[PDB]
Amino acid sequence: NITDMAGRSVVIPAKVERILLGEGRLFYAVSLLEGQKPFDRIVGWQGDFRKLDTQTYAVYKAKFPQVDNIPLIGNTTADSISPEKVLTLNPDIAIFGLSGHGPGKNSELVKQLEKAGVPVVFVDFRTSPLKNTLPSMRVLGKVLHREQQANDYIKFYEDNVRKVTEITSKIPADKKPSVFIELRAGAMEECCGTAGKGNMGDFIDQAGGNNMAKNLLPGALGTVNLEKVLSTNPDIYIASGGKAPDNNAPGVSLGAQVTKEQAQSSLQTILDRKGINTLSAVKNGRSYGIWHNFYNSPYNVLAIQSFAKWFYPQQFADLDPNNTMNSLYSQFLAIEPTGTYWVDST
Amino acid sequence: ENITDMAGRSVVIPAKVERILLGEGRLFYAVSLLEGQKPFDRIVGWQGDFRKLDTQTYAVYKAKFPQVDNIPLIGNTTADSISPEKVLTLNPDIAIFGLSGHGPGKNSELVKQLEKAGVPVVFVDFRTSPLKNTLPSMRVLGKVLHREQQANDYIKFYEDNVRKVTEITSKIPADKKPSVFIELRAGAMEECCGTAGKGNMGDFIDQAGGNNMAKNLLPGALGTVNLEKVLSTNPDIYIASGGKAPDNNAPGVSLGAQVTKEQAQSSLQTILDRKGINTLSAVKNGRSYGIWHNFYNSPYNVLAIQSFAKWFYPQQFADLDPNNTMNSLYSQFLAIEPTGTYWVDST
Amino acid sequence: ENITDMAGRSVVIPAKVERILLGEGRLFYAVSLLEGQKPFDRIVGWQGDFRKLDTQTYAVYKAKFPQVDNIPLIGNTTADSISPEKVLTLNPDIAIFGLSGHGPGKNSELVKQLEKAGVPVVFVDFRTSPLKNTLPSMRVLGKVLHREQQANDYIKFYEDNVRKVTEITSKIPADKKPSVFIELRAGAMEECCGTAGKGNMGDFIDQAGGNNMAKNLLPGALGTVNLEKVLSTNPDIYIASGGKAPDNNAPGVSLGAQVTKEQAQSSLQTILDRKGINTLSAVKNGRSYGIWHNFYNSPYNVLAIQSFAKWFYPQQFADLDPNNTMNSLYSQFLAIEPTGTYWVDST
Amino acid sequence: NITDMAGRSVVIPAKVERILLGEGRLFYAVSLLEGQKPFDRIVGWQGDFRKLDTQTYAVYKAKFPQVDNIPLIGNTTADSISPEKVLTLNPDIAIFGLSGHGPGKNSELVKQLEKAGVPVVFVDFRTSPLKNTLPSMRVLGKVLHREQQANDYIKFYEDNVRKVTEITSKIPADKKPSVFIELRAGAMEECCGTAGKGNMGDFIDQAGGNNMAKNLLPGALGTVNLEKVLSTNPDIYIASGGKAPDNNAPGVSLGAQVTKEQAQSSLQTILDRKGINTLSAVKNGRSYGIWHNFYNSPYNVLAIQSFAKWFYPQQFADLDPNNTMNSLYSQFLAIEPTGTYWVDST
Ligand SMILES: N=C(N)NCCC[C@H](NC(=O)c1cccc(O)c1O)C(=O)N[C@@H](CO)C(=O)O
Ligand SMILES: N=C(N)NCCC[C@H](NC(=O)c1cccc(O)c1O)C(=O)N[C@@H](CO)C(=O)O
Ligand SMILES: N=C(N)NCCC[C@H](NC(=O)c1cccc(O)c1O)C(=O)N[C@@H](CO)C(=O)O
Ligand SMILES: N=C(N)NCCC[C@H](NC(=O)c1cccc(O)c1O)C(=O)N[C@@H](CO)C(=O)O
Ligand SMILES: N=C(N)NCCC[C@H](NC(=O)c1cccc(O)c1O)C(=O)N[C@@H](CO)C(=O)O
Ligand SMILES: N=C(N)NCCC[C@H](NC(=O)c1cccc(O)c1O)C(=O)N[C@@H](CO)C(=O)O
Ligand SMILES: N=C(N)NCCC[C@H](NC(=O)c1cccc(O)c1O)C(=O)N[C@@H](CO)C(=O)O
Ligand SMILES: N=C(N)NCCC[C@H](NC(=O)c1cccc(O)c1O)C(=O)N[C@@H](CO)C(=O)O
Ligand SMILES: [Fe+3]
Ligand SMILES: [Fe+3]
């Protein structure tokens, strides 16, 4: 038996072959365990990975066209999941997130699955990445019978994060740069989405930054008004996005099918917005883009490294997130790394 | 009949208004120009900023209108302290909010609640972009409160009294303009120095033909510049804002309805005697002044634009008198008598 | 409604409170600022530290309120002496506890018992992290005791009176600051010398622009530094804390409501005449002072921050008088008259 | 009475009223001593200040038109100095530089002046700034009877340098960025002029940088070929210039009459040159401009600070060399600071 991220006891199945993904992008944690056979044990998933990660999807489709035939249990919201379609896939395990675009610990679907005799595991990369990322992988390892892959990934992760924390854990608060992260910048109805005590805030903390929204918000995600950002006038501005290159909607283009030219061109649009464009950080060129889906992925060590190099350029001159990304893919994944997951303003 | 507010949103003009909700208490100043001798007749409730952050002007209105104490306070001095429940049970027929300040903004939940309740919401602004927004705000308030005459009268008064300044300062070339720093609530904040960028009192500096040293240091209307940056820039003219009550020995400039010239100058001097500030060229040369803080969010801000022009070019505006303008303002529009000191020069 | 206490825990605000339990008796000081002329009206019971470790302030309240003797003592002066049974039979509707001190902490069994009994528990702090916690503690007590006005009034008073110090000391560079050692309950502990690290009275030294020699010797808010370490560091300024009653022949400094200047000066001198202490440069040079110990856990601690600044920079704070601040505090908030000596200088 | 920078003993004159400047830009050291009467005691000077510092000249001329009437003893080279014109000015002291566009310790003119009974003082801000800048000011103080001004300036300088060395003195060599400084970049016949163990090299050393030319060159100044720079591929590129805005000759525009936008546009031209534009430092945006005349001025504490903030951006985020310049001008000089003495690439 194991304790999941909701504190609940889960009896590990003897053999797993029918994994249900409550949130599609929980695939990222699964991908680190399944080696060259990524989709072999997925009976169905939330449609967020296919619809909100179109780039990473297309790359896996070109090498694995059977991905199109994995059933979508819903669209991009917990409320759109048919519990009936879920149960007819006869899962032998269901992986859910404490938060996100899929069911949480108190949903009806979780109770239905408990009545059906199906083990449910809660992980978390989104609410409390710092507390939860590694424990989540340890647990997924045990319940999916991929302890070796999991232990390998934890060692890789700890080592690559320790490269940052060995330095930033000793830096005193008054020497840290102030940071604002604008999630899905440009692309929300009301500006400005950001992270508080949690989510990408954990990355700012680890990378030795000072999140200006840490004390403005009670939860992991929330909203701060444009004028509050202008008034705080933080040292460093970071925008997250995952927009596909050939999408004329507002947002930052980043992901597997994005070139540096397009990442720079679209970040600039984001930085040219009224108000934003007068920020000291934007004028001084301390303005950056990070791929949004790192907000819910155990690949988040790539962002902690990208934030650290932006917060202390020379102290992390020698650190290369692209090499960490390449080591990750070659050691663990079944596709080749492409595209741009981070960008600096021209 | 609809109107476009200061947030760009369309608002349907109520047929009759008798229950005005003030998102920020000091938005009363705009309302006071419209309500003549019956200032508080139509106010169902307001933010507590006017009563708690404008104690002097409050006390003067209370002595003539004791019923002001019975207007409900929907919160203290911050948007986050407003109970949306208390707000809705006052059954307002209009809510007036500010684009910025100590009350809810355009994206607050309370604004959405009120829209669900069928209550028209109007955004005004005297604080973020006074130059763009002050007159349009009054025009709009005129239409939605059915006081078009009072509003048009006040716009004419305002335009004329500002034109007295801009007719001169609009033709002055940049290289003849004095550099200016305004230290908001000088001495009274934890961390020095609050100031205004391209907005707020910065708009007044611009209009009065001054050169705001913080214009390009800051992205927003308000922000913070460090003492050493001020010392380094060493601007021609120093201005401190305050609204401290006379009998308060804490640091801050005393200005307002119950402040005498002696208290305003004694307390400005304390502010100018602070380490660092006291080595400014502007302080040593006596180009140091005090302005009443609440002009940072009031359509009476024409008084500050004029005080600024007279400090920026003393001889060219020798003949201009802001005290005459305040008196014309009060007598024409208000229901109280002008008292106290709203600005001061160092001696 | 709900609020966050000083332990990070959410507390549901009772609709009406009439049975307040004080985990530490001297938490009364925070309550006294809210209860006006009816100080003891809502206290069902308290730890015996206020009655037994604050005999002077107790006696003054007893003479005006003899019913104070009938408030139940839930224990003596240590968390371990509190009977949880006596506590629960008082049927409290709220319990106020301190993150640290002579009463239960956040992990005690009594706190869990009360949670099982459906009784809200609120953690405040004036002792571990006064700088971070004093004002937030008062705001919180305001909300849960339905005295938001009194609390907000006291915060404004406090901020203003501290700002009188910090406006000056916040700009002073480290190399111009005096070194300071504070000896808590000097002369009265078994092993010399108790003091404060990064917390407790250390926060006051920091704010008053001093350099606490024990800041980096100690991990916690309280600890112990050896006499020889003090002698070796030989700090600029020596401060002794005490609260000993005048007619108490035990060792320590006499300070409090029933102490005269001469009893405070004479007893400080005994403390300064002790072997080792008496060779300190600060003692020989007369930069030696006494402060009332209980300021180590009281929102009246603004009086200590002000006494410290005036000892650290005598001429820069010549004009500041902590006695006026105490009198303004008492008259505005309390139900007794200020008496005695809360601070003393060596002759 | 005092030992100059050439090791020679100079007899302090009882009263000085006729100062001869071997190199015009030695005026900068004099200006720190003469308060509001900068030109009162100058009998004549080399034409380098008037002809190679046209901007700083024009600013002093607008307040002091009598500067145009100070005699020019030559143009911009030691060989163009008429010793006859020099001697008829009847100087009572001559200030010369160990190196530069004026006579050195072995020149004939120095011997002529010794025969004429005129005290000669050697200073140095150019060959060995680190060893010589402060001793030079101490000496000038004594011989010009401005000991107070000199001691005031030394304290100011030491304090403002200590702001840098407190941090960079504890950085180990292997964490330091490699740096190349291209003096009068774009403006020489043959690329690339630079500094070795001396001149602006001393500033790189102090600011915790690693001068790639330190061991390529024997002297304070020299030349390294473009290909050697490309091959070393240093972390940080710095170009010096002092070109006037309205001068369309090649080089970087910096000085009292230069705006930031003109300094950025002209630095960019310099960075767009063949070879230079493939440097990692240029592509990564670690490319900067510094005002050339800091290569021979006791105001050089401004460049040391500008270099440290470029070498360690976050560790010196709170340091402002512009506030330092302003404290310098207000405390010591008779004119108002204007223009751009340093620039970052867009
Ligand atoms: N399209 C929707 N209606 N909901 C989206 C899903 C869940 C929601 N998402 C976010 O808040 C969010 C914020 C910033 C950036 C993102 O990518 C986001 O997905 C959400 O998290 N809701 C909370 C509270 O209900 C939760 O599920 O815990
Ligand atoms: N809690 C909400 N209602 N909205 C916040 C999240 C929902 C929605 N998110 C996306 O469209 C999205 C796209 C790519 C990756 C993601 O994680 C996403 O969450 C959203 O942000 N909607 C905007 C309007 O488009 C909004 O509601 O502000
Ligand atoms: N007491 C508080 N914690 N907040 C007050 C809320 C408004 C805040 N005020 C200022 O920035 C300010 C600055 C100088 C002088 C003043 O009188 C001020 O009130 C504020 O303006 N917030 C901005 C952005 O947060 C806004 O609402 O647009
Ligand atoms: N946005 C903030 N966090 N601070 C700026 C304003 C908050 C507060 N304002 C006032 O007290 C105030 C008083 C009169 C008139 C106003 O318009 C006011 O805003 C403030 O300044 N607090 C101080 C704490 O003493 C501070 O922020 O340093
Ligand atoms: N009578 C006892 N045996 N213990 C008393 C408990 C409180 C204890 N007090 C001190 O350590 C102290 C030190 C110097 C001066 C004082 O007035 C003191 O009261 C205490 O603080 N305990 C801490 C650590 O154990 C706590 O409760 O967190
Ligand atoms: N936790 C401990 N063991 N000692 C430290 C404090 C215990 C005791 N404190 C007091 O008597 C006291 C008096 C007035 C006000 C206070 O806050 C007090 O704590 C104490 O000091 N004990 C001495 C023995 O006398 C000691 O332990 O050295
Ligand atoms: N105008 C000339 N033809 N010669 C000037 C003589 C000084 C010469 N200067 C430089 O080489 C120099 C190099 C880079 C950047 C500069 O600003 C320079 O002035 C020089 O230093 N010559 C040597 C050897 O005679 C010396 O003076 O020690
Ligand atoms: N020793 C040499 N022959 N040349 C190097 C310096 C001589 C000349 N110097 C300047 O133009 C100059 C301008 C401003 C400030 C200075 O210190 C200067 O030296 C020079 O650079 N000539 C170039 C021809 O463009 C060259 O020799 O490459
Ligand atoms: Fe999302
Ligand atoms: Fe305000």
User: Is B221 in Cβ contact with A227 (below 8 Å)?
Assistant: yes
**Rounded CA separation A116/C154 (Å):** 59
Those residues of chain C whose CB sits closer than 8 Å to some CB in chain B are 152, 160-161, 163-164, 166-168, 171
User: Is A177 in Cβ contact with D317 (below 8 Å)?
Assistant: yes
Contacts of D323 in chain B (CB under 8 A): 228-229, 231-232
CA of B254 to the centre of ligand 1 (A): 48
Residue with tokens 């060493």, as numbered in its chain: B234
Pairing of strands C20-22, C94-98: parallel
CB pairs under 8 A between A and D: 28
Residues whose CB is less than 8 angstroms from the CB of residue D299 and which lie 6 or more positions away in sequence, other chains included: D28, D325, D328
User: Is B128 in Cβ contact with A227 (below 8 Å)?
Assistant: yes
User: Is B234 in Cβ contact with D323 (below 8 Å)?
Assistant: no
Those residues of chain A whose CB sits closer than 8 Å to some CB in chain B are 190, 223, 225, 227, 230-231, 233, 275, 278-280
Round the CA-based radius of gyration of chain B to a whole number and report it.
Answer: 20
Please give the residue of chain D at the shortest CA–CA distance from A282. Answer: D346
Strand partners, D238: D181, D288
Q: Is C102 left (phi over 0), alpha (psi -120 to 50) or beta?
A: alpha
Q: Alpha helices, DSSP H only, in A100-146?
A: 108-115, 129-144
**Rounded CA separation D31/B288 (Å):** 31
Query: Burial letters for A247-285: b for 16+ Cβ neighbours within 10 Å, e otherwise?
Result: eeebbbbbbbbbeeebbbebbbebbebeebebbbbbeee
Nearest CB to B100; choose among A223, A227, A280: A227
Q: Is B238 helix (H, G, I), strand (E, B) or coil?
A: strand
The technique is X-ray
CA of A267 to the centre of ligand 9 (A): 19
Nearest CB to B251; choose among C152, C167, C171: C167
**Rounded CA separation C283/C237 (Å):** 8
Nearest CB to B219; choose among A190, A225, A279: A279
Nearest CB to B250; choose among C152, C160, C168: C160
By alpha-carbon position, which residue is closest to atom 7 of ligand 6? C189
Q: Is D315 helix (H, G, I), strand (E, B) or coil?
A: coil
Which of D69, D67, D66, D26 lies closest to D46 in space, CA to CA? D26
**Rounded CA separation D179/A159 (Å):** 30
Nearest CB to B220; choose among A190, A223, A227: A227
Query: Burial letters for D3-14: b for 16+ Cβ neighbours within 10 Å, e otherwise?
Result: ebbbeeebeebe
Contact B185, B297 (CB under 8 A): no
Give the pocket of ligand 8 (CB within 6 Å). D 52, 184, 187-190, 242, 292
The upper half-sphere exposure of residue C322, i.e. CA atoms within 13 Å in the direction of its Cβ, equals 22
Residues whose CB is less than 8 angstroms from the CB of residue B300 and which lie 6 or more positions away in sequence, other chains included: B29, B326, B329
CA of A215 to the centre of ligand 9 (A): 22
Q: Which value, to the nearest 10 degrees, does the dihedral of the CA atoms of residues C140, C144, C149, C152 take? A: 0
**Rounded CA separation A84/B51 (Å):** 59
Resolution of the PDB structure in angstroms = 2.5
CA of B300 to the centre of ligand 10 (A): 16
Helix (H) or strand (E) holding C9: none
**Rounded CA separation C34/C22 (Å):** 14
**Rounded CA separation D102/D21 (Å):** 9
Q: Count other Cβ atoms within 10 Å, centred on residue C11.
A: 19
**Rounded CA separation C25/C8 (Å):** 22
**Rounded CA separation B85/D272 (Å):** 63
Q: Count other Cβ atoms within 10 Å, centred on residue C3.
A: 18
**Rounded CA separation D270/D100 (Å):** 25
Which of D133, D128, D138 lies closest to D301 in space, CA to CA? D133
Does C223 sit in the ligand 6 pocket, CB within 6 Å?
A: no
Concatenating the DSSP letter of every residue in C256-289 gives BTT--HHHHHHHHHHHHTSTTGGG-HHHHTT-EE
Determine the angle formed by the axes of helices C302-312 and C148-169, rounding to 10 degrees: 10
Strand partners, D194: D222
Given the CA of residue A52, which atom of ligand 1 is nearest to it? 17
CA of A194 to the centre of ligand 3 (A): 20
By alpha-carbon position, which residue is closest to atom 12 of ligand 2? A52
Which of C282, C252, C256 lies closest to C270 in space, CA to CA? C252
Phi, psi (rounded to 5 degrees) for D342? -165, 150
Phi, psi (rounded to 5 degrees) for B37? -90, 0
CA of A100 to the centre of ligand 9 (A): 7
By alpha-carbon position, which residue is closest to atom 3 of ligand 1? A77
Strand partners, B290: B240, B344
CA distances from C265 to A17, A19, B33, C237, C343 (A): 83, 79, 62, 17, 9
Contacts of D322 in chain B (CB under 8 A): 232
Q: How many residues does chain D have?
A: 346
- Rounded to a whole number, what is the distance in Å from the CA of D327 to chain B's nearest CA? 7
By alpha-carbon position, which residue is closest to atom 15 of ligand 7? D183
Q: What token pair was written down for B13?
A: 């003009």
Does B188 sit in the ligand 3 pocket, CB within 6 Å?
A: no
Chains within contact range of chain A (3+ C-beta pairs < 8 Å):
B, D
**CA dihedral sign, ordered A280, A286, A291, A292:** negative
**CA dihedral sign, ordered B294, B295, B299, B300:** positive
Best of B78, B82, B249 to disrupt the C interface by mutation (most C CBs within 10 Å)?
B249
**Rounded CA separation B184/B170 (Å):** 25
CA of A96 to the centre of ligand 2 (A): 19
Contacts of D346 in chain A (CB under 8 A): 285, 346
Q: What token pair was written down for D144?
A: 């010009």
**Rounded CA separation A170/A168 (Å):** 5
Q: Which value, to the nearest 10 degrees, does the dihedral of the CA atoms of residues C79, C80, C84, C85 take? A: -130
Nearest CB to A314; choose among D177, D344, D346: D177
User: Is D344 in Cβ contact with A175 (below 8 Å)?
Assistant: no
Q: If 0-12 CB within 10 Å is exposed, 13-18 middle and 19+ buried, where does residue A246 land?
A: exposed
Which of D94, D74, D75 lies closest to D26 in space, CA to CA? D94
Task: Count, in order, helices (H) and strands (E) of chain D.
Answer: 13, 14
Q: Which value, to the nearest 10 degrees, does the dihedral of the CA atoms of residues A256, A261, A266, A271 take? A: 130
Pairing of strands B211-212, B222-224: unpaired
Best of D163, D305, D326 to disrupt the B interface by mutation (most B CBs within 10 Å)?
D326
Chains within contact range of chain C (3+ C-beta pairs < 8 Å):
B
Ligand closest to CA A187: 2
Q: What token pair was written down for D36?
A: 């509001």
Please give the residue of chain B at the shortest CA–CA distance from A229. Answer: B220
Pairing of strands D19-21, C343-345: unpaired
CB pairs under 8 A between B and D: 14
User: Is B219 in Cβ contact with A227 (below 8 Å)?
Assistant: no
CA–chain centroid gap for B200, Å, is 8
Which of A256, A297, A254 lies closest to A27 in space, CA to CA? A297
Does B179 sit in the ligand 3 pocket, CB within 6 Å?
A: no
Contact A10, A117 (CB under 8 A): no
Which of D314, D313, D316 lies closest to D288 in space, CA to CA? D313
Given the CA of residue D25, which atom of ligand 8 is nearest to it? 17
Those residues of chain B whose CB sits closer than 8 Å to some CB in chain D are 228-229, 231-234
CA–chain centroid gap for D193, Å, is 15
Best of B175, B216, B225, B232 to disrupt the D interface by mutation (most D CBs within 10 Å)?
B232
Identity of residue D163: K
